[PDB]
Each structure stands twice: as C-alpha cells, then as structure tokens.
Amino acid sequence: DGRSGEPFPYPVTVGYMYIMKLHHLVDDKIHARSTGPYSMITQQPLGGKAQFGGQRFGEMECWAMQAYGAAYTLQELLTIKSDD
Amino acid sequence: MLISQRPTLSEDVLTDNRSQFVIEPLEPGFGYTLGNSLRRTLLSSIPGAAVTSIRIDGVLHEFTTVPGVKEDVTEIILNLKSLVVSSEEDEPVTMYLRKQGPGEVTAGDIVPPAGVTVHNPGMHIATLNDKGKLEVELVVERGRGYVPAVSGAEIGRIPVDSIYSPVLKVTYKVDATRVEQRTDFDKLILDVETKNSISPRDALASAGKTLVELFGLARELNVEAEGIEIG
Amino acid sequence: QITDWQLASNAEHSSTGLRSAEVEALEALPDTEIKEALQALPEEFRMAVYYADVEGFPYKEIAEIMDTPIGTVMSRLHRGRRQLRGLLADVAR
C-alpha cells in the first residue's frame, strides 16, 4: 500500500491490459449556466452547451418535485428561472 | 527545493488523557507521509513501564481458580494489565500485593518500592470475601510498545502481556483542505488516547523528537536542498 | 422547429444579440460615471442637454417644456455641452 506502507495481506491479480480512451470526455460534457441567451420563440433558455444553454427540467422531474411537496422550488424553476 | 506554506499543529483536548491534533495545511499526499509513521511511532517508540509477570500465592499448577477471591485468575490478569506504573532505572523490579480483611483491593494497597509510581491507585483489582487472603508478586520493567507474554523455570510465576506504551490508542485520518485554488491539500488528524503517565502532548513531542532523529540519519548522508517550511 | 443553434447563429449577425437577464439587470443600473458628470452640471444646463441630446427634442420644444426664451435654451445647451466635454474624455465609456 503506497499510503500506509503495509503490504496488502493477500496476493492481488496483476498484469497488463489494453485500455482505450473513449470519446466521451469530461472536457466536452461539463457545462454550467447562471444566465444566458433565450429563445425568441418560447422565451425559455436556449438548449445545448454550444449555445451556453440551460438544463432541461422535464415532466418526470416535476413529478419528483411534487412528490416532495416542494412548491416554491417547482414554481421558481418554471417561472423566474425560465420564461418569466 | 521551493518553500512551502508553513503547516501548523493544533490541539483539541477531549479528555485529560485524550486529544486530537491537527497538522494543516500539508502539501498534497504528505498527510499519508506523516500519518502512519506518526501513529506507529506514538505507539511503539515511547518507553514506559508495565507488569512483566505475576505470581499468585496458593495456585501454581492449577491457574483456573484462586481460592478466597471472587475474580478468577485471568480476570486478575486483565485488570493487572490495566495497572499504570512508571519506573526509573531499567531492571526487573518486584512488588508485592497483600490484603486480608474483607473488602475490595485497589492499586494503592500495592507497596511501591523506591523509584516506581502507581498512577491509578483507585483502580479495582480483586474482591476479598470473609477470611479471604490475597498475596501476589508483580514484576515491573521498562520497555516500548506491546510485547506478548514470554516459561517453566519456577512454578507459580505466569508471564503476562506487557503493555509498555503510555499511549492506549491512536487513529489517524487525512481530510481535504484548500490552499489558494487547490482544494486537494492534506489535513492530518491524529486521535490519541494515553495513560495518565504522560499527556498526549508530550507523547506527540517525543514522537517528533524520535522521528527527527531517525530521518536525521538520512539527513546526515549529505547536505542538499530540501523542502523547508519553517517561518 | 427552429433549433436553438439556428437562433444563436442568426443572432451573431443581428443588430442586437441575445441578451441575458444579467445583461438586462446591469444595463438597467446607474452608470455612476455619466450620472456624476451630469449632477456636477447645474440643474438648468443638465435639463437642457437632457431634453436636447439625450431625449432628442427640437430646440423650440425645449424652449416650451421649460419656460425660457430660445436664447437661454441655446446658451445653456452650448455651455452645458462644453462643461460636459470637460468633465469626461472617453473614446468609449
């Protein structure tokens, strides 16, 4: 163990494996928006990272909010955070 | 070679014999550099005194039951291993515990020879019934760490597990702390519980001196630039 | 449906882009630069230059809004303009 220094009490399978770097990369996936462009049509935030867009809060997520009984979170998400 | 932002040692006292020390901030990874070495040093590197062996009068070949006492033999061995004692010179030093009248025996009823100290005189030892007689010999030596019982020779003398270390228990943990845009810096937390012989403070200080002496051996091979945190 | 990508791409070439609630709120805030230079002007001159340069009224209408002859409106316009030119020099601000 490189941290404590003690040996691990049991022999561990070791060897060489061929590992590939897949094209799903966190540099492309990470996105965050406080405020940004909105659609001229629906007046909701644009979608997609390239558009500096907001996250989709969908029907099932509203079901989750209602099952929690959180009224102000749900209203805030669907009004002042979107098309108000 | 470059200078590091100086880490600090803080003390949060829990009980008189129990304390948590926090060394922070440490450069990433160094919490595990200091942690296990400080724990093993605190446990095994501090010299202390304890009971090497005992001899109970009235029982030699048997060792199951002691007549005249409620506790059995091994239950006497247990709370005799809990005896907190300190000695000056290092030689086996014999002590004697004797009591007659019905009541309870404590560590104060043991007669310390000159140069030894019983730090927990209120510790229960055995319960003497009516007419019960208690005579036992306790050998005390100085050592380090925890040495298991070492027998033949003369009957009646039983070697016991000797807890030399003045520190009872040590556990450590490494938590994340943030220094200027880096949240991965190391924060070392040591939880140490000791006998009343010494404080956790002086135990950590003695461990520091010991390890400074140890790594001084590598320090002596040459004098070349290293990480310097002072100031 | 028109995609958000097409809306943004079209906005890149548009006279006014896609503004955000942040840009709106900060644009609604006081300048604290221009406002201070306007408050340093006396109330008559800042009023004349407000109705003239900022609002865009013709000069006669400024002479009507505040009750003054044409001469005080024009003179206060030129002097207030000069003083404001002194109080700030900016290629952009």
Coordinates of C-alpha atoms in Angstrom, one line a residue:
Chain A
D1 CA 0.0 0.0 0.0
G2 CA 1.6 3.2 -1.2
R3 CA -0.1 5.2 1.6
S4 CA 0.4 3.4 4.9
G5 CA 3.3 1.3 3.6
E6 CA 1.9 -2.0 4.9
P7 CA 1.7 -4.9 2.4
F8 CA -1.8 -5.9 1.3
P9 CA -2.4 -9.1 3.1
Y10 CA -3.4 -11.2 0.1
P11 CA -1.9 -11.6 -3.4
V12 CA -3.7 -9.5 -6.0
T13 CA -4.1 -10.3 -9.7
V14 CA -1.8 -8.0 -11.7
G15 CA -0.9 -8.0 -15.3
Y16 CA -1.2 -5.9 -18.5
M17 CA -4.5 -4.9 -20.0
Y18 CA -5.2 -2.9 -23.2
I19 CA -7.2 0.2 -22.3
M20 CA -8.7 2.6 -24.8
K21 CA -9.6 6.3 -24.2
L22 CA -13.2 6.7 -25.3
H23 CA -14.6 9.8 -27.0
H24 CA -16.8 10.6 -24.0
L25 CA -14.6 13.2 -22.3
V26 CA -15.4 15.4 -19.3
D27 CA -14.0 18.4 -21.1
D28 CA -16.9 18.2 -23.6
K29 CA -19.5 17.2 -21.0
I30 CA -19.1 19.8 -18.3
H31 CA -21.4 22.8 -18.7
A32 CA -22.9 25.3 -16.3
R33 CA -25.0 28.4 -16.8
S34 CA -26.2 31.1 -14.3
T35 CA -27.9 33.2 -17.0
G36 CA -27.6 33.2 -20.8
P37 CA -29.4 33.6 -24.2
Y38 CA -33.1 32.9 -24.5
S39 CA -35.2 31.7 -27.4
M40 CA -37.1 34.5 -29.3
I41 CA -39.9 32.0 -29.8
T42 CA -40.6 30.3 -26.4
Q43 CA -38.6 32.8 -24.3
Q44 CA -37.0 29.9 -22.5
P45 CA -33.2 29.5 -22.1
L46 CA -31.5 28.0 -25.2
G47 CA -30.5 24.4 -25.1
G48 CA -27.1 22.8 -25.6
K49 CA -23.7 23.6 -24.3
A50 CA -22.5 25.3 -27.5
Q51 CA -25.4 27.7 -27.1
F52 CA -24.5 28.3 -23.4
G53 CA -27.8 26.7 -22.6
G54 CA -29.8 25.7 -19.6
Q55 CA -30.7 22.3 -18.3
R56 CA -34.0 20.6 -19.2
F57 CA -36.3 20.2 -16.2
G58 CA -38.9 17.8 -17.6
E59 CA -42.2 16.3 -16.7
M60 CA -40.8 13.5 -14.6
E61 CA -38.6 15.9 -12.6
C62 CA -41.8 17.9 -11.9
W63 CA -43.3 14.7 -10.7
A64 CA -40.4 14.3 -8.3
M65 CA -40.8 17.9 -7.1
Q66 CA -44.5 17.4 -6.4
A67 CA -43.9 14.1 -4.6
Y68 CA -41.5 16.0 -2.3
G69 CA -44.2 18.7 -1.9
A70 CA -41.8 21.4 -2.8
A71 CA -44.0 24.1 -4.2
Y72 CA -41.6 27.1 -4.3
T73 CA -38.7 25.1 -5.9
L74 CA -41.1 23.9 -8.6
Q75 CA -42.6 27.3 -9.2
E76 CA -39.2 29.0 -9.1
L77 CA -37.8 26.6 -11.7
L78 CA -40.7 27.0 -14.1
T79 CA -41.2 30.8 -13.7
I80 CA -38.3 33.1 -12.7
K81 CA -35.7 30.6 -13.9
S82 CA -37.2 30.0 -17.3
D83 CA -39.8 32.1 -19.2
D84 CA -40.8 34.8 -16.8
Chain B
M1 CA 13.7 22.9 -3.1
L2 CA 11.0 25.6 -3.1
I3 CA 9.4 27.0 0.1
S4 CA 6.1 25.6 1.3
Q5 CA 3.4 27.4 3.2
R6 CA 4.0 26.5 6.8
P7 CA 1.8 23.9 8.3
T8 CA 0.6 24.3 11.9
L9 CA -0.1 21.9 14.8
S10 CA -3.3 22.5 16.7
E11 CA -4.6 20.7 19.8
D12 CA -8.2 20.0 20.6
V13 CA -8.5 18.5 24.1
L14 CA -11.2 15.9 24.6
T15 CA -10.3 14.4 28.0
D16 CA -7.2 14.8 30.1
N17 CA -5.6 11.7 28.5
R18 CA -7.3 12.1 25.1
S19 CA -6.6 14.7 22.5
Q20 CA -6.9 15.3 18.7
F21 CA -4.0 17.0 16.9
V22 CA -4.4 18.7 13.5
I23 CA -1.4 19.3 11.2
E24 CA -2.6 21.6 8.4
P25 CA -2.2 22.6 5.6
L26 CA 0.1 19.8 4.2
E27 CA 1.2 19.6 0.6
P28 CA -0.9 17.0 -1.3
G29 CA -0.1 13.5 -0.2
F30 CA 2.0 14.4 2.8
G31 CA -0.8 13.6 5.3
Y32 CA -0.1 9.9 4.5
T33 CA 3.6 10.5 4.7
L34 CA 3.4 11.7 8.3
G35 CA 0.3 9.7 9.3
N36 CA 1.3 6.0 9.6
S37 CA 4.8 6.8 10.8
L38 CA 3.5 9.2 13.5
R39 CA 0.9 6.5 14.6
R40 CA 3.4 3.7 14.8
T41 CA 6.0 6.0 16.4
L42 CA 3.4 7.1 19.1
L43 CA 2.5 3.5 19.8
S44 CA 5.8 1.6 19.7
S45 CA 8.6 4.3 20.2
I46 CA 7.7 5.8 23.6
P47 CA 9.4 4.0 26.6
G48 CA 7.1 3.1 29.5
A49 CA 6.8 0.6 32.4
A50 CA 4.3 -2.3 32.9
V51 CA 3.9 -5.7 34.6
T52 CA 6.1 -8.4 33.0
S53 CA 4.9 -11.3 35.2
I54 CA 3.0 -12.1 38.4
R55 CA 2.9 -14.9 40.9
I56 CA -0.3 -15.7 42.8
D57 CA 0.1 -17.5 46.2
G58 CA -2.0 -20.6 46.7
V59 CA -2.1 -21.5 42.9
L60 CA 0.8 -22.8 40.8
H61 CA -0.1 -25.9 38.8
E62 CA -3.8 -25.1 38.5
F63 CA -4.3 -21.5 37.3
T64 CA -8.1 -21.8 36.9
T65 CA -9.5 -20.5 40.2
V66 CA -7.9 -18.6 43.1
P67 CA -9.5 -19.5 46.5
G68 CA -10.8 -16.7 48.6
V69 CA -11.3 -14.3 45.8
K70 CA -14.4 -13.7 43.6
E71 CA -12.5 -13.0 40.4
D72 CA -10.8 -15.9 38.6
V73 CA -7.1 -15.9 37.5
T74 CA -7.4 -14.4 34.0
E75 CA -9.8 -11.7 35.3
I76 CA -7.0 -10.7 37.7
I77 CA -4.5 -10.7 34.8
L78 CA -6.8 -8.4 32.8
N79 CA -7.1 -5.6 35.4
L80 CA -3.5 -6.1 36.4
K81 CA -2.5 -5.4 32.8
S82 CA -4.5 -2.1 33.2
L83 CA -2.2 -1.1 36.0
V84 CA -0.5 2.2 35.2
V85 CA 3.1 2.2 36.6
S86 CA 6.3 4.0 35.9
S87 CA 9.9 3.1 36.8
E88 CA 13.2 4.9 36.8
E89 CA 16.1 2.5 36.3
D90 CA 15.6 -0.4 33.9
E91 CA 15.9 -3.7 35.7
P92 CA 13.1 -6.1 36.7
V93 CA 11.7 -4.7 39.9
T94 CA 9.4 -6.9 42.1
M95 CA 6.4 -5.5 44.0
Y96 CA 4.1 -7.3 46.4
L97 CA 0.3 -7.0 46.9
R98 CA -1.2 -8.5 50.1
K99 CA -4.6 -8.0 51.8
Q100 CA -6.5 -9.8 54.5
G101 CA -9.7 -8.1 55.7
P102 CA -12.9 -8.5 53.6
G103 CA -13.5 -5.7 51.2
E104 CA -12.1 -4.6 47.8
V105 CA -8.4 -4.3 46.9
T106 CA -7.1 -1.4 44.9
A107 CA -3.7 -0.4 43.3
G108 CA -3.0 1.7 46.4
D109 CA -2.8 -1.5 48.5
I110 CA 0.3 -2.4 46.5
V111 CA 3.5 -1.3 48.2
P112 CA 5.6 0.6 45.7
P113 CA 9.4 0.2 46.1
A114 CA 11.5 3.3 45.8
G115 CA 11.7 4.5 42.2
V116 CA 8.3 3.3 40.9
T117 CA 4.9 5.1 40.8
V118 CA 1.3 3.8 40.6
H119 CA -0.6 6.4 38.7
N120 CA -4.1 4.8 39.1
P121 CA -4.3 4.0 42.8
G122 CA -8.1 3.8 42.7
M123 CA -8.2 1.0 40.1
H124 CA -10.1 -2.0 41.3
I125 CA -8.1 -5.3 41.4
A126 CA -9.9 -8.0 43.3
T127 CA -12.7 -8.5 45.8
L128 CA -11.7 -10.2 49.1
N129 CA -14.5 -12.1 50.8
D130 CA -14.7 -13.0 54.5
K131 CA -11.4 -14.6 55.7
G132 CA -10.0 -14.3 52.1
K133 CA -6.3 -13.7 51.7
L134 CA -4.6 -12.1 48.7
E135 CA -0.9 -12.4 48.1
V136 CA 0.6 -11.8 44.6
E137 CA 4.0 -10.6 43.3
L138 CA 4.2 -8.2 40.4
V139 CA 7.4 -7.7 38.3
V140 CA 7.8 -4.4 36.6
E141 CA 10.2 -3.5 33.8
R142 CA 10.6 -0.6 31.3
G143 CA 10.1 -1.2 27.6
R144 CA 8.4 0.0 24.4
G145 CA 5.2 -0.9 22.6
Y146 CA 3.3 -4.1 23.4
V147 CA 5.2 -7.3 24.0
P148 CA 3.3 -10.6 24.3
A149 CA 3.9 -12.9 27.2
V150 CA 7.3 -14.5 27.0
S151 CA 8.4 -20.4 30.6
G152 CA 8.9 -23.3 33.0
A153 CA 11.7 -22.4 35.5
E154 CA 10.0 -21.9 38.9
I155 CA 6.3 -22.7 39.3
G156 CA 3.7 -20.1 40.2
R157 CA 5.1 -17.3 38.0
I158 CA 3.0 -16.5 35.0
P159 CA 4.3 -14.2 32.2
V160 CA 1.6 -11.8 31.1
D161 CA 1.1 -9.5 28.1
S162 CA 3.0 -6.3 28.8
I163 CA 1.6 -3.0 27.6
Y164 CA 4.7 -0.8 27.8
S165 CA 3.4 2.1 25.7
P166 CA 2.0 5.0 27.7
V167 CA -0.4 5.7 24.8
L168 CA -3.5 3.5 24.7
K169 CA -4.9 4.1 21.2
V170 CA -4.0 6.0 18.1
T171 CA -6.0 6.5 14.9
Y172 CA -5.4 9.0 12.1
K173 CA -7.3 10.4 9.1
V174 CA -6.4 12.6 6.2
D175 CA -9.0 15.2 5.1
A176 CA -9.1 17.7 2.2
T177 CA -8.2 21.3 2.9
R178 CA -7.9 24.2 0.4
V179 CA -4.9 26.5 -0.1
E180 CA -5.3 29.1 -2.8
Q181 CA -7.3 27.4 -5.7
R182 CA -6.1 23.9 -4.7
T183 CA -8.7 22.0 -2.7
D184 CA -6.7 18.8 -2.6
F185 CA -4.2 19.9 0.1
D186 CA -3.8 17.4 3.0
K187 CA -5.1 17.9 6.6
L188 CA -3.8 15.4 9.1
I189 CA -5.9 14.5 12.1
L190 CA -4.5 12.3 14.9
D191 CA -6.7 11.0 17.7
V192 CA -4.6 9.8 20.6
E193 CA -5.6 8.4 24.0
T194 CA -3.0 7.7 26.6
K195 CA -2.4 6.6 30.2
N196 CA -2.2 9.3 32.8
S197 CA 1.6 8.7 33.0
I198 CA 2.1 11.3 30.3
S199 CA -0.1 13.7 28.3
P200 CA -0.8 13.2 24.6
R201 CA 1.1 16.5 24.1
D202 CA 4.4 15.1 25.5
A203 CA 3.7 11.8 23.6
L204 CA 3.4 13.6 20.3
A205 CA 6.5 15.7 21.1
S206 CA 8.5 12.6 22.0
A207 CA 7.4 11.0 18.7
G208 CA 8.5 14.2 16.9
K209 CA 12.0 14.0 18.5
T210 CA 12.3 10.3 17.7
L211 CA 11.4 10.7 14.1
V212 CA 13.6 13.8 13.7
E213 CA 16.4 11.7 15.0
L214 CA 15.5 8.8 12.7
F215 CA 15.3 10.8 9.4
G216 CA 18.4 12.7 10.6
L217 CA 20.3 9.5 9.6
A218 CA 19.4 10.2 6.0
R219 CA 19.9 13.9 6.6
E220 CA 23.5 13.1 7.5
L221 CA 24.4 11.5 4.2
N222 CA 24.9 14.9 2.6
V223 CA 23.6 18.5 2.9
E224 CA 21.5 19.3 -0.1
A225 CA 18.4 21.4 -0.8
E226 CA 15.1 20.0 0.5
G227 CA 11.6 21.3 1.3
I228 CA 11.9 23.9 4.1
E229 CA 8.7 25.0 5.7
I230 CA 10.0 27.0 8.8
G231 CA 8.6 30.5 9.1
Chain C
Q1 CA -39.0 23.7 -35.4
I2 CA -36.2 26.3 -35.5
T3 CA -33.3 25.0 -33.4
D4 CA -31.5 26.9 -30.7
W5 CA -28.3 26.7 -32.7
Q6 CA -30.0 28.5 -35.6
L7 CA -31.4 31.2 -33.3
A8 CA -27.9 31.8 -31.8
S9 CA -26.2 31.7 -35.2
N10 CA -28.7 34.2 -36.6
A11 CA -28.2 36.4 -33.5
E12 CA -24.5 36.5 -34.1
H13 CA -25.1 38.7 -37.3
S14 CA -28.1 40.6 -35.8
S15 CA -28.0 44.3 -34.8
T16 CA -28.9 43.2 -31.2
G17 CA -27.7 39.8 -30.0
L18 CA -29.4 37.5 -27.5
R19 CA -29.2 39.4 -24.2
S20 CA -29.3 37.6 -20.8
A21 CA -31.1 38.5 -17.6
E22 CA -27.7 39.6 -16.2
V23 CA -27.0 42.0 -19.1
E24 CA -30.6 43.4 -18.7
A25 CA -30.2 44.0 -15.0
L26 CA -26.7 45.5 -15.2
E27 CA -27.8 47.7 -18.2
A28 CA -30.7 49.0 -16.0
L29 CA -28.2 50.0 -13.3
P30 CA -26.9 53.6 -12.9
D31 CA -23.7 54.5 -14.7
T32 CA -22.1 56.2 -11.6
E33 CA -19.8 57.7 -14.2
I34 CA -22.1 59.7 -16.6
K35 CA -24.5 60.3 -13.7
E36 CA -21.9 62.0 -11.6
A37 CA -20.8 64.2 -14.6
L38 CA -24.4 65.1 -15.1
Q39 CA -25.0 66.0 -11.5
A40 CA -22.0 68.3 -11.5
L41 CA -23.8 70.4 -14.2
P42 CA -26.2 73.0 -12.8
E43 CA -29.8 71.8 -13.0
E44 CA -30.8 74.2 -15.8
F45 CA -27.9 73.1 -18.1
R46 CA -28.3 69.4 -17.4
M47 CA -32.0 69.7 -18.0
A48 CA -31.4 71.5 -21.4
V49 CA -28.9 68.9 -22.5
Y50 CA -31.2 66.1 -21.3
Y51 CA -34.1 67.3 -23.3
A52 CA -31.8 68.1 -26.3
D53 CA -29.1 65.5 -26.6
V54 CA -30.5 62.6 -24.6
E55 CA -34.2 62.8 -25.4
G56 CA -33.9 64.5 -28.9
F57 CA -36.4 67.3 -28.7
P58 CA -36.0 70.1 -31.2
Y59 CA -34.8 73.4 -29.7
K60 CA -38.2 75.2 -29.8
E61 CA -39.8 72.3 -27.9
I62 CA -37.2 72.7 -25.2
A63 CA -38.0 76.4 -25.0
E64 CA -41.6 75.3 -24.5
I65 CA -41.1 72.5 -22.0
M66 CA -39.2 74.6 -19.5
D67 CA -40.4 78.2 -19.7
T68 CA -37.5 80.1 -21.0
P69 CA -36.7 82.1 -24.2
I70 CA -34.9 80.4 -27.0
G71 CA -31.7 82.3 -26.0
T72 CA -31.4 80.7 -22.6
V73 CA -32.1 77.2 -24.0
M74 CA -29.5 77.6 -26.8
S75 CA -26.9 79.2 -24.5
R76 CA -27.4 76.7 -21.7
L77 CA -27.1 74.0 -24.4
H78 CA -23.7 75.2 -25.6
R79 CA -22.3 75.9 -22.2
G80 CA -23.5 72.7 -20.7
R81 CA -22.1 70.8 -23.7
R82 CA -18.7 72.5 -23.1
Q83 CA -18.7 71.7 -19.4
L84 CA -19.7 68.0 -20.0
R85 CA -16.9 67.8 -22.7
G86 CA -14.5 68.9 -20.0
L87 CA -15.8 66.6 -17.3
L88 CA -15.1 63.5 -19.4
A89 CA -12.9 62.4 -22.3
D90 CA -13.7 58.9 -23.5
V91 CA -13.4 57.2 -26.8
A92 CA -15.8 54.7 -25.2
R93 CA -17.3 54.6 -21.7

